[PDB]
Every structure is written in structure tokens, then in C-alpha cells.
Design a binder for this molecule. Structure first.
Ligand SMILES: [Cl-]
Ligand SMILES: [Cl-]
Ligand SMILES: [Cl-]
Ligand SMILES: [Cl-]
Ligand SMILES: [K+]
Ligand SMILES: [Mg+2]
Ligand SMILES: [Mg+2]
Ligand SMILES: [Mg+2]
Ligand SMILES: [Mg+2]
Ligand SMILES: [Mg+2]
Ligand SMILES: [Mg+2]
Ligand SMILES: [Mg+2]
Ligand SMILES: [Mg+2]
Ligand SMILES: [Mg+2]
Ligand SMILES: [Mg+2]
Ligand SMILES: [Mg+2]
Ligand SMILES: [Mg+2]
Ligand SMILES: [Mg+2]
Ligand SMILES: [Mg+2]
Ligand SMILES: [Mg+2]
Ligand SMILES: [Mg+2]
Ligand SMILES: [Mg+2]
Ligand SMILES: [Mg+2]
Ligand SMILES: [Mg+2]
Ligand SMILES: [Mg+2]
Ligand SMILES: [Mg+2]
Ligand SMILES: [Mg+2]
Ligand SMILES: [Mg+2]
Ligand SMILES: [Mg+2]
Ligand SMILES: [Mg+2]
Ligand SMILES: [Mg+2]
Ligand SMILES: [Mg+2]
Ligand SMILES: [Mg+2]
Ligand SMILES: [Mg+2]
Ligand SMILES: [Mg+2]
Ligand SMILES: [Mg+2]
Ligand SMILES: [Mg+2]
Ligand SMILES: [Mg+2]
Ligand SMILES: [Mg+2]
Ligand code: NA
Ligand code: NA
Ligand code: NA
Ligand code: NA
Ligand code: NA
Ligand code: NA
Ligand code: NA
Ligand code: NA
Ligand code: NA
Ligand code: NA
Ligand code: NA
Ligand code: NA
Ligand code: NA
Ligand code: NA
Ligand code: NA
Ligand code: NA
Ligand code: NA
Ligand SMILES: [Sr+2]
Ligand SMILES: [Sr+2]
Ligand SMILES: [Sr+2]
Ligand SMILES: [Sr+2]
Ligand SMILES: [Sr+2]
Ligand SMILES: [Sr+2]
Ligand SMILES: [Sr+2]
Ligand SMILES: [Sr+2]
Ligand SMILES: [Sr+2]
Ligand SMILES: [Sr+2]
Ligand SMILES: [Sr+2]
Ligand SMILES: [Sr+2]
Ligand SMILES: [Sr+2]
Ligand SMILES: [Sr+2]
Ligand SMILES: [Sr+2]
Ligand SMILES: [Sr+2]
Ligand SMILES: [Sr+2]
Ligand SMILES: [Sr+2]
Ligand SMILES: [Sr+2]
Ligand SMILES: [Sr+2]
Ligand SMILES: [Sr+2]
Ligand SMILES: [Sr+2]
Ligand SMILES: [Sr+2]
Ligand SMILES: [Sr+2]
Ligand SMILES: [Sr+2]
Ligand SMILES: [Sr+2]
Ligand SMILES: [Sr+2]
Ligand SMILES: [Sr+2]
Ligand SMILES: [Sr+2]
Ligand SMILES: [Sr+2]
Ligand SMILES: [Sr+2]
Ligand SMILES: [Sr+2]
Ligand SMILES: [Sr+2]
Ligand SMILES: [Sr+2]
Ligand SMILES: [Sr+2]
Ligand SMILES: [Sr+2]
Ligand SMILES: [Sr+2]
Ligand SMILES: [Sr+2]
Ligand SMILES: [Sr+2]
Ligand SMILES: [Sr+2]
Ligand SMILES: [Sr+2]
Ligand SMILES: [Sr+2]
Ligand SMILES: [Sr+2]
Ligand SMILES: [Sr+2]
Lengths: 56, 73, 237
RNA sequence: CGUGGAAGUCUGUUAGAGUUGGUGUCCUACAAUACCCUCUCGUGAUCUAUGUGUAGGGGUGAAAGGCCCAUCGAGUCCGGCA
RNA sequence: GUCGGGUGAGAACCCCGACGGCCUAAUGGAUAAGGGUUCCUCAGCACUGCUGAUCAGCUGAGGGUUAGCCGGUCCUAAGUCUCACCGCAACUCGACUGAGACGAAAUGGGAAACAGGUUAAUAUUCCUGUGCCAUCAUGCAGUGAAAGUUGACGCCCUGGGGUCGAUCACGCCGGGCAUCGCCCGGUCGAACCGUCCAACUCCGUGGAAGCCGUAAUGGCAGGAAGCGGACGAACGGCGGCAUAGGGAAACGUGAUUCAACCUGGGGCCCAUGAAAAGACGAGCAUGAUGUCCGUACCGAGAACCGACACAGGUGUCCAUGGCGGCGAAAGCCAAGGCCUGUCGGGAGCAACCAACGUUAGGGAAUUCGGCAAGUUAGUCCCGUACCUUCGGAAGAAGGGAUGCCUGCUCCGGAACGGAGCAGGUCGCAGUGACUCGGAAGCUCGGACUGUCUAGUAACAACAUAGGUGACCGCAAAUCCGCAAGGACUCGUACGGUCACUGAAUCCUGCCCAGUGCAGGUAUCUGAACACCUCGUACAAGAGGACGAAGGACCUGUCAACGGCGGGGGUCUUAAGGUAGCGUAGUACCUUGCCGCAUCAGUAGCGGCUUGCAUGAAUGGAUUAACCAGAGCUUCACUGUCCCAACGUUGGGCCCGGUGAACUGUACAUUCCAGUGCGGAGUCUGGAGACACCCAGGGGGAAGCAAAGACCCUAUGGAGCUUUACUGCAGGCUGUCGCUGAGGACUCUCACUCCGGGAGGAGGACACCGAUAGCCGGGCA
RNA sequence: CGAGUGGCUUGCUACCUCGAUGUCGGUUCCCUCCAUCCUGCCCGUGCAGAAGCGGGCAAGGGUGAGGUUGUUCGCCUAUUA
RNA sequence: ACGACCGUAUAGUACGAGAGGAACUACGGUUGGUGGCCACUGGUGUACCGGUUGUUCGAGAGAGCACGUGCCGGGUAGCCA
């Protein structure tokens, strides 16, 4: 079976959903963690310096 | 008794299986009463179809060589 | 290279674990205060998923219901005893001191009160040899003479299920079913059948180990494969 | 002679799984792996849904350097970076 | 699809009727996920729709989803998280241990709802009727109440009970057809309450020494049959429910086979087949309460995923509609659905192409190769070789039969079940279509079923059982973690780890020199601390003494890595190739030589065999069975071929509509020669050449598509290797600290482990922290 | 021994092409060359004849089917002018 | 747009001791190639006619489907070798 089109048809699982904390559709309903803001992982908001150029 | 295996597995394998299973399926004298009514219930588990005595013994024999030694000493 | 299979093992992932949740009981010697006064009746005989051998369900006088590592010849209705002054009959458990020499024993303790360690597999047994005020010598199933504390408890008789090893698995399916009940990854791909990246014996245009198989005891994990610190190999000589 | 009904047992497009040949059709496709016929398995080391675990020099691997979201002899994203 | 017709400015494709078709595990019905309003109505056509559109999943506006008893909600599963504790430089990191919580919507467990009616759209939710559950309140009863039962369970075979459905018989209602008198549909009616009980278990009686019983196993003086009895089932029977409901009407009765559902018997395991909540145990009346969330629609060749109205992908239940037949098979047909796998019109419709039918004579001559195609075929009877692990081979092979009609026999309770008989009779053909093996032999490989390169490899590769070696007594061996800690392990040598070989059978020789591993070791070598000498008012430093693991040295070991020759009638370097097999999937020479087979055989097989460069768990030989594995031979068959023809369907061609892309320095009607950076439409010399258009098969544009994979180069990259260089983990070992009392020893008090504890074992060791030497492609 | 012609084999060279001029063998379809295998016409003969042998002119036409091998090449069989 | 071969007569002749054994010419045919044509033989012929299996239309009659003829038998014109 091809990893392409034929393997795409099984994708009917819900993972990322609207986050209660940040509003972004990144709250993984299985992991119960927001990939965007870290809700469910940390009290502090997810943020990284690599999200922008080093001089900014 | 290894006819279930057909022309597969070779002499030794199905020959020892037939033997082990033959002696396993033999009439066994119950330790409780005396009737040759002991049948295997599972791996190492035996029972008398007469008095209902359920007991432990060898995996395929109700009594093992080393098992008989126990009584003696 | 990549970590070898022996290294993935230690991580304790699902594939390498034993189906504990499917296991019945941690068959240990029942604890008794002192005096010995303790007996029970064999209520049933069950199959132990963890050892591929029978196990006796025993109900005690104080009302305690526990599975026991059954020796050969134990059946429903029988009365088992556990204590210093227990009867010297098969199925009973008492310290090595009270056990007469020359008598076959199983489920021996390593340190008094641990609940049993030695001789627990199908059909095996330890031979109680010497007595003393300080030490009781026992011959374990491997043939090793083991000096033990005479206070170490042990059960009389050989473990039930003897002869299990006599019948061949015959086919892969049978091995499959047994393996599924143990903490083991199966089947086994030969190292020599892998790529260099996957195992020290991998690679080559034909299958053969790189260097010799006998590896030093000091070898680090990832390299300790083949014949671990072998004192010799082969059959001749 | 009958009874019995065993089997990683046989036939089988039962369901289902797989994928030998045609080096057919297609090859700005219906399709970034498709179509047809043919063919293998089909009570078992079987197939399958859902839930769940293992994460990047790390997993997973009946081992093909296979697979880890069209990405693998070291995923992907952004950053180091002009 | 077609002919009529309807609406409309406009109709091939929007609607009605008729005729004609398509779908049958799905193209029907109910749903999970997922979508998210796509559902219904009205109004529309700028957009979307492979053409058009009056239509629409499109545009706009409105509307639509109603629950004590269907799900959720509750329970616990693999497992997840939180808090505490501990680690970490630290944390949003991290393992354990506690506590708490989370974790199942078709498809785990679970208190209780059925029937009908109703809307444009909901419906076990609304309405009508009937019923049921839980909690609580009051009244009565009851003092029992928690032991127990249940929830609650694997795989294979099978009996009995039994509903729906299907069919049969007969009756009644309605329809159809019209030479007959046959054919179709209907003939209804729940939850619930009450009642009945087979199987299993048990009791009394009885008293079998051979009887009782089964599909089968089986049962018995430890008490069989028989008789009586206790307990005891259906989603089943029976009565009510029901002068409920439903039907135009009748508004049946019996039977067979029996899904569901109920209840038993047998067999299997180196496999043992959840848990918890809850329920029962534990009465009755009357009344009250039963909140919160989901509920539309699609569920797919247009509502999901795949950029698309994508020929792909995507779970569940309907597996009992009719004929057919072994059948959930083919083929045909209902119910139900559809003509939207959504562009049409025209040309005996050319060439050419895709699918396909038939081809005389020959019959594999085709080709690397029977690739492709074809041949065979269902069922019964007869009959069946070598070989073999005695299972198999085997449907071997080969031979015969096969329909209809009339009348019957046998088995069985019977079937609308099965096996036969006699007579008659039709065709070229009776498994008449459909369904439906071609067969045989030799050789190689792997024993077998199984695995694999999702997307050029399915194989001889991997796995496997079997064989073997290694490590380890559990405070273990092996392995993960920086640590706290952890997998193996609810495990204990009949174990489990680490490796090799790869079923059976017959076997598995010689070599320990090198390398590896392990053991020993007089002596030699071997770091640091401490100690001693020199030196320095100290120190740097130099030397000495002692000396661990390791090395030298010695031994063991090849089912460890590997080796098994040259010469002469020993030498390198330990041995000097044993059984076997052999021109091999290993043999250069090579198409080796002889034979078989053929007209002819680099093939294939057998024999020989000096083997360039076979050979014994780097396993050797050999082998029944098995195989989408490699090679060869024969019979059969055939358009593979001689050698091609005709035909069928869809294209192609013409017309309406829709409407891309690749590609483009320029010029460009070329041809023959030459020249040129040596492979020119464009330069030179000639030749030819009126322009434009249609169809064609692809000769050229060193055609289009890709900054060559090959090769080299770069003081490029990466993966892999090792006795490359340099290091880093890790293991072993000494030393210092923790660390204490009386070159060997005793002890207990730190510390460690075992023990519920009391207490036991161990003990200044071990662990841990630090440093030193050794090993160290495990890693950088 | 000496002199050459060809450009089919092999070698040499590194001019051309590495922002690609698709391999060998085969097949199918077309054109050509002559150093002629057959066929026409000739000369010589160790030419009686028949059958040959050697040579000349000559490219109109022909030069086929099969067994092993991927083979080109070649070996083999039976036909053949 | 025609190439080549075989056969008969010449002839058992010339030649030759014999064995063996020609030619000119005239005829008949074959093979390869070429162009055309279909009376004849052959193929096709999902035009047509018949037989017949399963199922559906109640039987009969007469029809549909079984892949673009269910299968089997025969086969006109045309097109063809
Ligand atoms: Cl095992
Ligand atoms: Cl629901
Ligand atoms: Cl029964
Ligand atoms: Cl010939
Ligand atoms: K090039
Ligand atoms: Mg235990
Ligand atoms: Mg073993
Ligand atoms: Mg497992
Ligand atoms: Mg293996
Ligand atoms: Mg490999
Ligand atoms: Mg490789
Ligand atoms: Mg390596
Ligand atoms: Mg090998
Ligand atoms: Mg090997
Ligand atoms: Mg899963
Ligand atoms: Mg409308
Ligand atoms: Mg609706
Ligand atoms: Mg469509
Ligand atoms: Mg023919
Ligand atoms: Mg040929
Ligand atoms: Mg074929
Ligand atoms: Mg009868
Ligand atoms: Mg061969
Ligand atoms: Mg195989
Ligand atoms: Mg592949
Ligand atoms: Mg395959
Ligand atoms: Mg093994
Ligand atoms: Mg083994
Ligand atoms: Mg192998
Ligand atoms: Mg040979
Ligand atoms: Mg050997
Ligand atoms: Mg380049
Ligand atoms: Mg290269
Ligand atoms: Mg590099
Ligand atoms: Mg502890
Ligand atoms: Mg490296
Ligand atoms: Mg080209
Ligand atoms: Mg000439
Ligand atoms: Mg010419
Ligand atoms: Na029998
Ligand atoms: Na295929
Ligand atoms: Na990585
Ligand atoms: Na349309
Ligand atoms: Na009832
Ligand atoms: Na049927
Ligand atoms: Na199989
Ligand atoms: Na050696
Ligand atoms: Na060798
Ligand atoms: Na297979
Ligand atoms: Na044909
Ligand atoms: Na062209
Ligand atoms: Na690389
Ligand atoms: Na020349
Ligand atoms: Na070629
Ligand atoms: Na010529
Ligand atoms: Na040839
Ligand atoms: Sr899915
Ligand atoms: Sr978290
Ligand atoms: Sr931050
Ligand atoms: Sr334990
Ligand atoms: Sr314990
Ligand atoms: Sr290797
Ligand atoms: Sr030996
Ligand atoms: Sr099978
Ligand atoms: Sr292929
Ligand atoms: Sr196509
Ligand atoms: Sr393709
Ligand atoms: Sr085909
Ligand atoms: Sr099959
Ligand atoms: Sr960058
Ligand atoms: Sr318009
Ligand atoms: Sr609609
Ligand atoms: Sr919950
Ligand atoms: Sr449920
Ligand atoms: Sr099942
Ligand atoms: Sr029945
Ligand atoms: Sr609905
Ligand atoms: Sr549906
Ligand atoms: Sr589909
Ligand atoms: Sr597919
Ligand atoms: Sr219908
Ligand atoms: Sr349309
Ligand atoms: Sr015909
Ligand atoms: Sr052939
Ligand atoms: Sr041939
Ligand atoms: Sr026959
Ligand atoms: Sr072998
Ligand atoms: Sr696969
Ligand atoms: Sr063997
Ligand atoms: Sr050695
Ligand atoms: Sr020899
Ligand atoms: Sr010019
Ligand atoms: Sr064209
Ligand atoms: Sr010339
Ligand atoms: Sr000539
Ligand atoms: Sr060549
Ligand atoms: Sr050659
Ligand atoms: Sr003549
Ligand atoms: Sr003569
Ligand atoms: Sr038809």
C-alpha cells in the first residue's frame, strides 16, 4: 500500500483541538497538552527565543 | 497419534509427541480411590473422573521419576 | 551505529515487558509469628501463567486465601502445614533445620523470611544435605552446593509440572504462545544476519562474525555480545 | 468395519488479508503508487476497529538500512544563519 | 436511455407517464469516526457543477434537532495526569512509592419503553394508549441483612429447547391472467403482568454382579434402570394486555427446517483466556421527584481523508428474500434504490489504437523463456506408479457415466432430504449457459505454515521447530537512567540472558602457532597515595622501597575468529583435508570428455572429475512433503509462429458546447556535398522550392522532460569499518574520604541488606564521593 | 623482402559532448558499397567428357529455415542456384 | 516487374577403353517477387435461421438477461488468402 493517497483515507482521528487557554487549535486531546502555549504542560506560557531571529 | 501433523516435522518431533501424548492419555490409577480414572486437566493438573480428586503432577505424566523419590525419603 | 537489541531491552518498553497484569500471584511463604501453629486446606489447583506450571489455592485456618507454589502430589482436600513444628510431609513448609537430611525440597529461601527464591521452576528441587547450628548445606538444581542459614524456610517435595521440557514445541506457533506469556522479545534475528550499524556481528558480503565471539567481561554494553567471558567453547577437549 | 473430528491441513474472488505474471491499461493519470485479468492466504506465528505505550544517534524492526504522517544510511519545525 | 407531456424567455440531461434498462454484502436499510448546517421551505443563477439547467450539496433569506426508562453521564481496562516525596545547577525535566483523579458514545460492565399516530424538517424525545425503573415522603408490614449468588468471560466439536424468516398443506380476503387453471399479495397485533419447563444439580424409593445411556465420550453396590420429589430456562409456549392499535378486506390453522435467544455433553493448553461499579440476597400502598449534555443531515464512484462533486482510502450490524447449487459461489429475479461511475449530435463509422470473438492446413517452427492465449474442469463409478519421515505421494495417471419423460424401490419421523431401479425418448453437444485442475518426468534451493524492501527485488534472503556453545544461585547474569531510580521479574537453572547453526536421517575429521576469551603464575614489568634518601629554613624537583588489575611467561579452549600447503622418499606458520560431495548458484581453462535426448542441444540429466579457488553447526551429505522460487524434457492445447483475414465494443474522423498544458534567442520551404571546436534548416558551392489547409506514422531538430547516477577533481558532506590519529563513556584494579574498637586476625557502633516486628545476616568491607593504572570503535 | 589501399577489428590520442547525443544483442523498415557467394558473359587449365580449379567484366535480382547460447561471433542439421 | 530453379525432348547421343556423360534449341512446371480479382476452394460473417442450459414474464405461445452473440449447429452479401 502506498504511503501517499491510499494511506490518507484512514485519517479520521481527532488530536489537535481548540485550546481552553490560548484559543489556538493546538490542544492535543489525547495528550491533553497545547503544542502552542503549553497548556497542560506548564503554568508559564510556552515561548522560545528561536521563534524569532537572534537579533530580535 | 501425531497423524494430525501429516507429513511435517520429521521423525523425532512427531515420534516423541505421539509417545508423550500416548502415556499422557493412558488410564491412570487415582491416588485417592484406585480406579484407572485420572485424566489431564491442563499443564501439570490431573483429576479422577470417579472421586473428583484434583491434583498436581508432571506436565504430561501424573507422576514423575523425581516425584516418586519424594515419598521414599 | 544504533543501540543493539540488548540495549533496547533495558528501557523496559511494552515489547520487552512481561504481561504482569495477566499474572496471578507472587507465590511467597506465608508469614507466621512463631510456634508453627498454622495449617490450611487445598481448595483448588490452578495454572500459573508466569511459570507454565500448576499452583495450589489454599485456604488457611485464620481465613486467609492464598495461591501456593505447589509441589508434586498435592490435591484438593489435602491439609498443608507451615511452621517450625510442621509435619514432615510433601507440601509442608518449615525451616531447613527441622527438615531431615536427604529429603528433596523446593522454593527455598535465600535469607530467612524472604518468601522463597531457589528451586521454583517445573520439576526441579534442591537437595538438603548437611545440618549444623550455623549452616545448612543445600544442593541447588544447577548442581551448586549452597551454604544457607538453617532458619531459611523451604517446602518439601519437587515442584509440580516436571518433564515439561521433554516434549518439543514442534512448531513456531507453540513457541509464539509461550513467549507471549513471558517478558521476552521473540523471534530472534541472528546478529550476523544484520547490518553493521545494528550489531557488532553485522555486515559482510556473507554471514559470519567480524571478530571472534568470546568477549571480555569488561566489554561495554553495545559491544558485549556473542560468548560472554567464556572459559572455553565447543565440545571437544 | 463403524464412531470420532484432529490439523500454523487441503479446495475455495464466503467475509477478509495479500500481491506472482501480463514487464497489459495509465504514465500533463481517475490516482504524487490508480485500473483490469491472472495469482497467494483464508482456524491462525490469522485478519480487523477503537483505545493505549515506545521519539530522533533515539524508537520500532521474523533484518529490507525496512518503518517512525507523500519526509529516513539518522524525521519534522524554527533557530545558530547572511 | 426512448416517445409523449409539464413548467419556463430559454429544456438532451428540472418534473410527470409510459416503454427500456442498471445495482443484490450492494448502487438497498441502520450506524461509528469524521464533516458541521451540508437537513426543510421559499426566492434565485453572478459563482460552483467536466456541456446545459428552469435543477442543485451552489447564492440569499427564513425554519428545523424536544427523552426518568437511546447514548453520555457512573465503573473499572491497557495506561495517563495531579499532589506529596526524592533527583537535578535548574525546570515546563526525571524513575519509584503513597494519595487523588483521568481513561470505553459503533464495540468492555450497566436500574428502567413498548405499540401506534403526527411534521416541509424531530421523534423509544412530541401526541394517544399501555408499561417499567430509581430515589424520596407518608402508611402498613419487617427486624431480618450478610454469608452467598451475580456482574464475569478462552479455543475446537456437538446435543437438546426454540422465535423470525423461508417453504409445504388447507381455508378466507384482494389482485393478475385468460385455450389451460395457474400465478402474486394479504390473512396483523408489542413492551409488560401472570403462568408453563427442558437441561444441569440434588433427595427418597428401588436393588442391577451386567445392565442403563449417548451423535460421541460414557454411568453404577462409593448404588445402575424404573418410580416419586426438591431446585430450576428462553428475546420461547400459553392467558391477559386488546369492544389497544393497525387493515380496503380477510382480520387462518397445521407442518417442516429452524438465525436470534435458552440450556447441556465432549475435546485442547510448555497458551489458562479482565476488572470495578452495580445487582440479587431483602415485602407492599399511595404520592413526589427524575435535573444537566448529545439528538438536524451525509456516512460516500458529490456531505469523511486524499488540494477536486478524485475509478484511491475509510470500522460496525442487516450472513435467513426467491430460483439455483455444496454454498454468504455464478447466473437470473424481488423488496428497496437508481438512469449522476453525469456532455452531446453525425459518418456501415476509413487508417491507426484499447478491450475482445472466430479463423483453413500446420502445431511452439515464435521467443532469453509457451511471455500471451489456450487446453482441463462440476459429480459418481472403476482404477492409480516411483518414492516415502508410512502421514503422504493422490484428484497421481488412465477409463466409464451424466439430459428429459413414465412408473417405482431403498434409508429416514420427515423434508419442497439422500441413494438407486425399470421402461420410454430428443440433440452435434445433458457439470448443454453458468460454475468448473491441464497432466507426467528429471535437476537446483529452502525442510514445512510463516516474514520482507509502504512506492521497480517475495527469492535461495529473514523467521521457525530442532542442534549447540557461553554467562549467572537472584544483593545473580544481561540491559536502561546524570541522578533519584528501572526492565527482565507476580520470574529463580525443567530459569533467562548472550550468541551460532537451522526440520528429520547419516554424520560432524585434524590444528591452540597468530588473534579472542578464560585460568594460573617462581621470576620479570606494572600508577597514584602513604613511606624512606637527596634537594629547598618550606616548596617545586630528582631517586628509592613496596607493588594492584594488566602485560611477559604457562595452561585450557575451534558447534571461538579462523586454517587444513610447498617440497621430497620434511619446510612456512599449529595442522596438511578424514566422511562425503565435485566442471557445482563454487571449475579459469570450458561448449572439459563419454553417454542419454534431438535432423541438429554453449542447454538439461547421468558418468568421469587431477577441485584455477569443494568439504563437515564459516556445518557436510542427503532427503519424503511443501513452493506465484531457478533450469530442462514429454503428452495435450493453441493465431506465439508460417501469414495474416473478417468481425464486435469504446475511441479515432465531422458538427454543438466546454476548454488546459508541455514548449518558444532569433530567423526558418528544404535536399546533396563541403566547411567549421572533429556530429550545420541558418556558413560555402550547387540542386530543389507557388501559398495555405486536413489526416498519418514518428526520419531529423545530436526533439521535449532532469545544473550526469558513471569517471575524475574539491586541502566538499555523510553512513559504515578497523591492531588509522586523538579522545570520551563503560568495566576491572590500587589509593583517600565515609571509617569505628581490640602482614595476618578478632570485634561492633557507623554503613548495607533480610525481617511486620522482635530480631537476623553482613560490617568498617560493600555502597557512594575522589583519584590513579589497565582494557575500551560502545561512542565522538 | 619491398610498395600500398581501406577505415570492418584492436590499440593510441583526448579535439567534441559531463545544465545527459539512452547500452549490447535481437527485431522491424528503408537506402547504399564491392574486395562477387549465386545468377549472365568471358579467359586459363595439371581443359576428353561430367565434375572442378584459378582468373576477368559485372551490384539487376537473390543470398532462405532451424538446434545450443542473451550473445555479436561461432559450432551443428537438413534443405539451396 | 520481374529474378531463379526443376523436369521432358535433344540423349543414354557428342566425349570416353570403360565407368561416366554434356550442349544449342523447343517445351512443361515450381519457387521468390509484383499487380489485380472473388466464378471456384477456404476464413469471417455479435445480418439471418435452428437446437438448447439457468432464470424472469403464472403455464402455453412469445420474449429479456447470462458483456457487449449464454452456449452449440448452419451460414447470405461483402471483405478477404
Ligand atoms: Cl521457552
Ligand atoms: Cl447517541
Ligand atoms: Cl449430549
Ligand atoms: Cl529446410
Ligand atoms: K557527457
Ligand atoms: Mg512468588
Ligand atoms: Mg531449547
Ligand atoms: Mg510479549
Ligand atoms: Mg534466528
Ligand atoms: Mg542484509
Ligand atoms: Mg545491504
Ligand atoms: Mg559497530
Ligand atoms: Mg550461513
Ligand atoms: Mg556462518
Ligand atoms: Mg493501535
Ligand atoms: Mg426550488
Ligand atoms: Mg429525517
Ligand atoms: Mg461524480
Ligand atoms: Mg488455426
Ligand atoms: Mg528462432
Ligand atoms: Mg501464463
Ligand atoms: Mg420408510
Ligand atoms: Mg545448475
Ligand atoms: Mg521457504
Ligand atoms: Mg518494492
Ligand atoms: Mg512469494
Ligand atoms: Mg535454536
Ligand atoms: Mg535452544
Ligand atoms: Mg537460511
Ligand atoms: Mg556434467
Ligand atoms: Mg569442525
Ligand atoms: Mg552537473
Ligand atoms: Mg561512485
Ligand atoms: Mg567524510
Ligand atoms: Mg529493601
Ligand atoms: Mg567513527
Ligand atoms: Mg536523441
Ligand atoms: Mg571488380
Ligand atoms: Mg542495388
Ligand atoms: Na478410528
Ligand atoms: Na497485482
Ligand atoms: Na536525528
Ligand atoms: Na447530465
Ligand atoms: Na413469558
Ligand atoms: Na437458497
Ligand atoms: Na497456510
Ligand atoms: Na591457535
Ligand atoms: Na574451508
Ligand atoms: Na509461502
Ligand atoms: Na486472434
Ligand atoms: Na519525427
Ligand atoms: Na552517507
Ligand atoms: Na591506409
Ligand atoms: Na539494438
Ligand atoms: Na548484383
Ligand atoms: Na545459431
Ligand atoms: Sr482511522
Ligand atoms: Sr503535564
Ligand atoms: Sr521561554
Ligand atoms: Sr518475591
Ligand atoms: Sr516479601
Ligand atoms: Sr559481519
Ligand atoms: Sr572435536
Ligand atoms: Sr489452512
Ligand atoms: Sr517483471
Ligand atoms: Sr486506462
Ligand atoms: Sr506507474
Ligand atoms: Sr491479458
Ligand atoms: Sr485456500
Ligand atoms: Sr538559516
Ligand atoms: Sr443564464
Ligand atoms: Sr437537498
Ligand atoms: Sr470516568
Ligand atoms: Sr456499551
Ligand atoms: Sr471467536
Ligand atoms: Sr434443533
Ligand atoms: Sr437521525
Ligand atoms: Sr446510510
Ligand atoms: Sr468506496
Ligand atoms: Sr489498490
Ligand atoms: Sr425493483
Ligand atoms: Sr451534467
Ligand atoms: Sr460461426
Ligand atoms: Sr519452443
Ligand atoms: Sr526454438
Ligand atoms: Sr475422467
Ligand atoms: Sr541442508
Ligand atoms: Sr508490507
Ligand atoms: Sr539437520
Ligand atoms: Sr590460543
Ligand atoms: Sr581427499
Ligand atoms: Sr545557401
Ligand atoms: Sr499522431
Ligand atoms: Sr567495380
Ligand atoms: Sr559465378
Ligand atoms: Sr560487435
Ligand atoms: Sr565464442
Ligand atoms: Sr536432360
Ligand atoms: Sr550408365
Ligand atoms: Sr445480449
Amino acid at each position: 500500500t502506498g504511503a501517499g493517497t491510499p494511506s490518507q483515507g484512514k485519517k479520521n482521528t481527532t488530536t489537535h483541538t481548540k485550546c481552553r487557554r490560548c484559543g489556538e487549535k493546538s490542544y492535543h486531546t489525547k495528550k491533553k497538552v497545547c503544542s502552542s502555549c503549553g497548556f497542560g504542560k506548564s503554568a508559564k506560557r510556552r515561548d522560545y527565543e528561536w521563534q524569532s531571529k537572534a537579533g530580535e | 497419534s501425531s497423524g494430525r501433523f501429516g507429513a511435517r516435522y520429521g521423525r523425532v518431533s512427531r515420534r516423541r509427541v505421539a509417545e508423550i501424548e500416548s502415556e499422557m492419555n493412558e488410564d491412570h490409577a487415582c491416588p485417592n480411590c484406585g480406579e484407572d480414572r485420572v485424566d489431564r486437566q491442563g499443564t501439570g493438573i490431573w483429576q479422577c473422573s470417579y472421586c473428583d480428586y484434583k491434583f498436581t503432577g508432571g506436565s504430561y505424566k501424573p507422576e514423575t521419576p523425581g516425584g516418586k523419590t519424594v515419598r521414599r525419603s | 551505529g544504533r543501540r543493539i537489541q540488548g540495549q533496547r531491552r533495558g528501557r523496559g518498553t511494552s515489547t520487552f515487558r512481561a504481561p504482569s497484569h495477566r499474572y496471578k500471584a507472587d507465590l511467597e511463604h506465608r508469614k507466621v509469628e512463631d510456634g508453627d501453629v498454622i495449617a490450611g486446606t487445598v481448595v483448588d489447583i490452578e495454572h500459573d501463567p508466569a511459570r507454565s506450571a500448576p499452583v495450589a489455592a489454599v485456604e488457611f485456618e485464620d481465613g486467609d486465601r492464598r495461591l501456593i507454589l505447589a509441589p508434586e502430589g498435592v490435591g484438593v482436600g489435602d491439609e498443608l502445614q507451615v511452621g517450625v513444628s510442621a509435619e514432615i510431609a510433601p507440601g509442608n513448609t518449615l525451616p531447613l533445620a527441622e527438615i531431615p537430611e536427604g529429603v528433596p525440597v523446593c522454593n527455598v529461601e535465600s535469607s530467612p523470611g524472604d518468601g522463597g527464591k531457589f528451586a521454583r521452576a517445573s520439576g526441579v528441587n534442591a537437595q538438603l544435605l548437611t545440618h549444623d547450628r550455623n549452616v545448612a548445606v543445600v544442593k541447588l538444581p544447577s548442581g551448586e552446593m549452597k551454604r544457607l542459614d538453617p532458619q531459611c524456610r523451604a517446602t518439601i517435595g519437587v515442584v509440580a509440572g516436571g518433564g515439561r521440557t521433554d516434549k518439543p514445541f514442534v512448531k513456531a506457533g507453540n513457541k509464539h504462545h509461550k513467549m507471549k506469556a513471558r517478558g521476552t522479545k521473540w523471534p530472534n534475528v541472528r546478529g550476523v544476519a544484520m547490518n553493521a550499524v545494528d550489531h557488532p556481528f553485522g555486515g559482510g558480503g556473507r554471514q559470519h562474525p567480524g571478530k571472534p565471539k568470546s568477549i571480555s567481561r569488561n566489554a561495554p554494553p553495545g559491544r558485549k555480545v556473542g560468548d560472554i567471558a567464556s572459559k572455553r567453547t565447543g565440545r571437544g577437549g
